[PDB]
Write a protein that holds these residues in place. Structure first.
Motif, PDB file in Angstrom:
ATOM      1  N   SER D  35      -6.123  10.826   4.992  1.00  0.00           N
ATOM      2  CA  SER D  35      -6.359  11.216   6.372  1.00  0.00           C
ATOM      3  C   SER D  35      -5.310  10.579   7.273  1.00  0.00           C
ATOM      4  CB  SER D  35      -7.766  10.814   6.833  1.00  0.00           C
ATOM      5  OG  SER D  35      -7.976   9.422   6.685  1.00  0.00           O
ATOM      6  N   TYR D  37      -4.184   9.550  11.419  1.00  0.00           N
ATOM      7  CA  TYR D  37      -4.751   9.159  12.703  1.00  0.00           C
ATOM      8  C   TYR D  37      -3.642   8.946  13.720  1.00  0.00           C
ATOM      9  CZ  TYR D  37      -8.878   8.431   9.860  1.00  0.00           C
ATOM     10  OH  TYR D  37      -9.926   8.607   8.989  1.00  0.00           O
ATOM     11  N   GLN D  39      -2.785   7.316  17.361  1.00  0.00           N
ATOM     12  CA  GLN D  39      -3.267   6.281  18.268  1.00  0.00           C
ATOM     13  C   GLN D  39      -2.265   6.095  19.395  1.00  0.00           C
ATOM     14  OE1 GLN D  39      -3.231   2.169  16.885  1.00  0.00           O
ATOM     15  NE2 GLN D  39      -5.113   1.738  18.032  1.00  0.00           N
ATOM     16  N   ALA D  44      -8.279   4.336  21.186  1.00  0.00           N
ATOM     17  CA  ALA D  44      -8.754   4.348  19.816  1.00  0.00           C
ATOM     18  C   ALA D  44      -7.986   5.387  19.001  1.00  0.00           C
ATOM     19  CB  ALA D  44     -10.249   4.650  19.772  1.00  0.00           C
ATOM     20  N   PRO D  45      -7.825   5.159  17.698  1.00  0.00           N
ATOM     21  CA  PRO D  45      -7.221   6.185  16.842  1.00  0.00           C
ATOM     22  C   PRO D  45      -8.018   7.480  16.888  1.00  0.00           C
ATOM     23  CG  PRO D  45      -7.265   4.084  15.708  1.00  0.00           C
ATOM     24  CD  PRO D  45      -8.053   3.897  16.973  1.00  0.00           C
ATOM     25  N   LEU D  47      -8.584  11.267  14.806  1.00  0.00           N
ATOM     26  CA  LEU D  47      -8.380  11.974  13.549  1.00  0.00           C
ATOM     27  C   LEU D  47      -7.524  13.218  13.766  1.00  0.00           C
ATOM     28  CD1 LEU D  47      -9.103  12.408  10.516  1.00  0.00           C
ATOM     29  CD2 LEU D  47     -11.070  13.730  11.320  1.00  0.00           C
ATOM     30  N   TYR D  50      -7.467  15.433   7.602  1.00  0.00           N
ATOM     31  CA  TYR D  50      -8.316  14.866   6.564  1.00  0.00           C
ATOM     32  C   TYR D  50      -8.198  15.719   5.308  1.00  0.00           C
ATOM     33  CZ  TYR D  50     -11.872  18.474   7.486  1.00  0.00           C
ATOM     34  OH  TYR D  50     -12.541  19.666   7.638  1.00  0.00           O
ATOM     35  N   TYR D  88      -1.095   6.562  11.522  1.00  0.00           N
ATOM     36  CA  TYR D  88      -1.554   5.822  10.356  1.00  0.00           C
ATOM     37  C   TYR D  88      -2.133   6.793   9.342  1.00  0.00           C
ATOM     38  CZ  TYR D  88      -1.231   1.772  13.463  1.00  0.00           C
ATOM     39  OH  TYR D  88      -0.789   0.809  14.340  1.00  0.00           O
ATOM     40  N   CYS D  90      -4.515   6.995   5.883  1.00  0.00           N
ATOM     41  CA  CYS D  90      -5.582   6.263   5.220  1.00  0.00           C
ATOM     42  C   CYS D  90      -5.966   7.003   3.950  1.00  0.00           C
ATOM     43  CB  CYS D  90      -6.802   6.108   6.130  1.00  0.00           C
ATOM     44  SG  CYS D  90      -8.176   5.233   5.357  1.00  0.00           S
TER      45      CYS D  90
END
Ligand SMILES: *[C@@H]1O[C@H](CO[C@@H]2O[C@@H](C)[C@@H](O)[C@@H](O)[C@@H]2O)[C@@H](O)[C@H](O)[C@H]1NC(C)=O
Ligand SMILES: [Cl-]
Lengths: 214, 182, 229, 214, 221
Positions: D35, D37, D39, D44-45, D47, D50, D88, D90
């Motif tokens: 996923s 993100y 920011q 806040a980050p 989405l 995904y 980022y 993940c």
């Protein structure tokens, strides 16, 4: 295979100091860790199991803690009798494995050595070999230098040394140096001496004897 | 000739309870007297027939199911029982006609450090029907979110190991079980 | 209080088979919650687990020792044994027997060692056994008026390790230093054991060093007097 | 972090850029669970991607995801000014564990390059009376927002006692940063000069202060 | 609308503990997981762990085991993150997010909670004058300023001449020293011609200590 890395390999602390030893596992083994204390010539003795549970009959100054990959053994007030090599052991997976050990030396005030020299006994001279022993007794630190002079001729290649482990009560060391000669070579020279130098000696100490002379 | 009960009771290796074995015993004369006349059975429970009079009643068919379970799970190998084994591994019908035979196998099936080969099913969406066998290794969903065959969080691999060690308490020691259906 | 007393030869020739035995005291070997293990420590090295055993037969060996390790139990004699075949110099170590606590439940913290045997050094070598000669290390005639003098025993030319030295049948320990043996160029070991005593006692107190070398069945009691001229 | 991203990437309004996300076989190359993100500063980050390539309801179609082996990629086409942010990746790593990448600062070049103004202040006489000394190097009006600061004692480099802030956007959409050198009053008076060198887009501008003779 | 709202910022000393709440609304709290992710200042995102409010199952990052505890209150739809044995490098913004568990997404995120872990106590700043060089002001322009040094915690505000002077003012973000204290500088650029007739006074306010320091800044002499 679970590998355990113990840091440091060696350490030297004073009496009353707080000592901390680390054991890092190659994987996370939760709280499946035990600590052992091995004094010279003795089997290892269980100190802590399950990372932090103290074994019945272990002084309260010992303590363990940690979880996962990193574990620490702490001696809150180091005592002279605590001189040992401490090992960690993982108790989660087979084969059972130990850490490499952390040898804990005691630091104390400088102590000069007492020096003695011993001629070869008449019983040994009957055997054709002569051994001359020089004793350095109850000194700190461990480093000492012993020169053998035979008629003021510095010897080399014919002497071996041996050092005791640190004494569990005064934290000193002792060293013996043996000069090996043939009975014929021993009878050719007269003055035998070992010259000792050490941090605690402001000038060299020479203990000598004369072959034959009482 | 004689029935091959020695092949079942004296087998070198037993199956896991989730993959319990079944040997159909046909065209033979069964000497049931020897079985009960053995003091080496810690469980010998018969249902609907008397163990002494095993050769006096009707014979539907003779099936010998065998597996290994935990000690405290032997009480689940019986009709009307509930629990991990009776719900998700081996289920006896309410009208069961046969005998349940079990003995401690600590010296055979438990190893130093753990014998992990013996497995049982820990999770399932529904209880097993009587005599149903389930050997699927599909990931089990315990939460609201799907798993797509991935193991993690609320998604469990359905099989767990007994890890038998001989120093275990008797409740966790391995027991070999033989169910005779008639 | 459970005790372990191990025994066996401290010298094994190369390619031969090491063999050691451990006798359990203060408790039966048919323990249902303990394993009986062997652990070895090469000189100057760490600890290596060899194997563990349940009284009824099951074993677990270290895969680092290939298939040359066998542990066995004699329930009728409260003993368990170790056999290491095809030994090399890499097998020279102090071997310990110990008791390992086993888990009673799945995923229970166990598998630590308590208690241990005293340890037996086994030296892998083809050299023959030789017992020591004990020569006195006499206190110097000069010495002091009322200070402290030193005396000792020279234990020379023996093989293999170890020897044990005590003074006055164990009644003299204060001030004693028994040095680690050194391996002479002759292949034989040699060590000295010394003790510091007051100079005033040299004429009134006797000093005997008790030298024991089990590999050669040697026991020597040597008196150490001031040398006469 | 087992997962590696490039520290910085930049593009111009209109082009397309790719942000790589390199892991190992047991995380990125084991699950389709990568996923992404976005920011923005102080926020806040959010989405963006995904399951490697799927977009949630609301994300522009200019963002897309892909994966080759153990490397996941985020590709933004037709760059806009609101796309500038930290990104980022993940990934699942097995055993109920997620792992983030180190993050990639994406810059959308949206205005002409500006060299930084540099102002270096010496220690005040008040601070030196308080037995402390601080050199203040203020850097303003540069773009893009990324400088490296190097300190010089005489002509020798200085590493210890250097505290430099991250760049911060000014109200004019250029960037500002400051760097402090902590010295003892003796270190400040013993040298002929101290210098603050600011490098920006390969070009360096230096400022120099010296103890005042009074 | 799905929303997560967290507790206010916290200032802690080393060895203490902090408990951050995360109130959920707009969705079925138990139908998803909650994960906690933190981010040190200027650093990257770090996954801390996951907790499922449905069954209470938890799992934490390897570098946090035995130190973090995650809990939920299903009745109030609130997840909690407790972190004990706080050390300075735990200074970070702590986020919570609705975890899709194995669906592989974190959405949406809470607003975040700043937890500052520092061995320093509350302290008003020392204000030193930043005087320009005589060579730096001979070209027509002069830069003079104020060094706001060794204060805790953030923030401070700097004005010039009680707010009358605003043109040419540039106040820079603070720096974090190894002491745990902050320092920033504010500078104003003025015509050198005014250095001998106009007075420049910086006004430093630090609300956490009710400290107001004024410092007149004069050319180097
Ligand atoms: C199962 O085995 C029992 C004991 O086996 C005995 O030992 C083995 C090693 C063989 O030598 C075997 O011939 C011995 O009898 C039997 O007593 C028992 O009858 C066997 N079970 C059946 C159903 O036959
Ligand atoms: Cl992470």
């Amino acid at each position: 295979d679970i590998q355990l890395t113990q840091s440091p390999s060696f350490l030297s602390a004073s009496v009353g100091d707080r000592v901390t030893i680390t054991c890092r596992a190659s994987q996370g083994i939760s709280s499946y860790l035990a600590w052992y204390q091995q004094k010279p010539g003795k089997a290892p003795k269980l100190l802590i199991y399950a990372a932090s549970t103290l074994q019945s009959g272990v002084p309260s100054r010992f303590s363990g803690s940690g979880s996962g990959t990193e574990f620490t053994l702490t001696i809150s007030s180091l005592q002279p009798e605590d001189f040992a090599t401490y090992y960690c052991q993982q108790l989660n997976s087979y084969p059972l494995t130990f850490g490499g050990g952390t040898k804990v030396e005691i630091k104390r005030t400088v102590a000069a050595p007492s020096v003695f020299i011993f001629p070869p006994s008449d019983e040994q001279l009957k055997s054709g070999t002569a051994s001359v022993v020089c004793l350095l007794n109850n000194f700190y630190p461990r480093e000492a230098k012993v020169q053998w002079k035979v008629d003021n001729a510095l010897q080399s290649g014919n002497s071996q040394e041996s050092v005791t482990e640190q004494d569990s009560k005064d934290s000193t060391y002792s060293l013996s140096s043996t000069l090996t000669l043939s009975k014929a070579d021993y009878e050719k020279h007269k003055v035998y001496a070992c010259e000792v130098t050490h941090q605690g000696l402001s000038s060299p100490v020479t203990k000598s004897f004369n072959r034959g002379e009482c | 000739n004689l029935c091959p009960f020695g092949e079942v009771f004296n087998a070198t290796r037993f199956a896991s309870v989730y993959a319990w074995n079944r040997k159909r015993i046909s065209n033979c004369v069964a000497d049931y007297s020897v079985l009960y006349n053995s003091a080496s059975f810690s469980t010998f429970k018969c249902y609907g027939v008397s163990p002494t009079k095993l050769n006096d009643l009707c014979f539907t068919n003779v099936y010998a199911d065998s597996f290994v379970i935990r000690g405290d799970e032997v009480r689940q190998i019986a009709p009307g029982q509930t629990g991990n084994i009776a719900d998700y591994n081996y289920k006896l019908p309410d009208d069961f006609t046969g005998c349940v035979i079990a003995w401690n196998s600590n010296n055979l099936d438990s190893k130093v450090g753990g014998n992990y080969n013996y497995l049982y099913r820990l999770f399932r969406k529904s209880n097993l029907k009587p005599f149903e066998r389930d050997i699927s290794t599909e990931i089990y969903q315990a939460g609201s979110t799907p798993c797509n065959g991935v193991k993690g969080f609320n998604c469990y691999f359905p099989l767990q190991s007994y890890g038998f060690q001989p120093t275990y308490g008797v409740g966790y020691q391995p027991y070999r079980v033989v169910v005779l259906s008639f | 209080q459970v005790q372990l007393q191990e025994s066996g030869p401290g010298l094994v020739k190369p390619s031969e088979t090491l063999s050691l035995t451990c006798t359990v005291f203060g408790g039966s070997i048919t323990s249902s919650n303990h394993y009986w293990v062997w652990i070895r420590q090469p000189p100057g090295k760490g600890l290596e687990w060899i194997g563990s055993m349940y009284y009824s037969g099951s074993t677990a060996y270290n895969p680092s020792l290939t298939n040359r390790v066998t542990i066995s139990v004699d329930t009728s004699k409260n003993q368990f044994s170790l056999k290491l075949s095809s030994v090399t110099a890499a097998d020279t170590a102090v071997y310990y027997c110990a008791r390992q606590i086993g888990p009673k439940r799945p995923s229970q913290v166990a598998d630590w060692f308590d208690p241990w045997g005293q340890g037996t050094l086994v030296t892998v070598s083809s050299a023959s056994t030789k017992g020591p000669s004990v020569f006195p290390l006499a206190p110097s005639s000069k010495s002091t008026s009322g200070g402290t003098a030193a005396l000792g025993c020279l234990v020379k030319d023996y093989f293999p390790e170890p020897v044990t030295v005590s003074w006055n049948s164990g009644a003299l320990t204060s001030g004693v230093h028994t040095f680690p043996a050194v391996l002479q160029s002759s292949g034989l070991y040699s060590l000295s054991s010394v003790v510091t005593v007051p100079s005033s006692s040299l004429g009134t107190q006797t000093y005997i060093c008790n030298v024991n070398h089990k590999p050669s069945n040697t026991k020597v009691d040597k008196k150490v007097e001031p040398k006469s001229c | 972090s087992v997962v590696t991203q490039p520290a910085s990437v930049s593009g111009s309004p209109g082009q397309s850029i790719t942000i790589s996300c390199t892991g190992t076989s047991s995380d990125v190359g084991s699950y389709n669970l990568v996923s992404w993100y976005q920011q923005h500063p102080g926020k806040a980050p959010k989405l963006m991607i995904y399951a490697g390539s799927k977009r949630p309801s609301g994300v522009s179609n200019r963002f897309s995801g892909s994966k080759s082996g153990n490397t996941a990629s985020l590709t933004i086409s037709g760059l806009q000014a609101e796309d500038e942010a930290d990104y980022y990746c993940c990934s699942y790593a097995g055993s109920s564990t997620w792992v983030f990448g180190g993050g990639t600062k994406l810059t959308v070049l949206g205005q002409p390059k500006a060299n930084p103004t540099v102002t270096l202040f010496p220690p005040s006489s008040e601070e030196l009376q308080a037995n402390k000394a601080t050199l203040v190097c203020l850097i303003s009006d540069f773009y893009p927002g990324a400088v490296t600061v190097a300190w010089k004692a005489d002509s020798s480099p200085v590493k210890a006692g250097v505290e430099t802030t991250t760049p911060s956007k000014q109200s004019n959409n250029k960037y500002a940063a400051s760097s402090y050198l902590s010295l003892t009053p003796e270190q400040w008076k013993s040298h002929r000069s101290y210098s603050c060198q600011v490098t920006h887009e390969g070009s360096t501008v230096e400022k120099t202060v010296a103890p005042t003779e009074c």
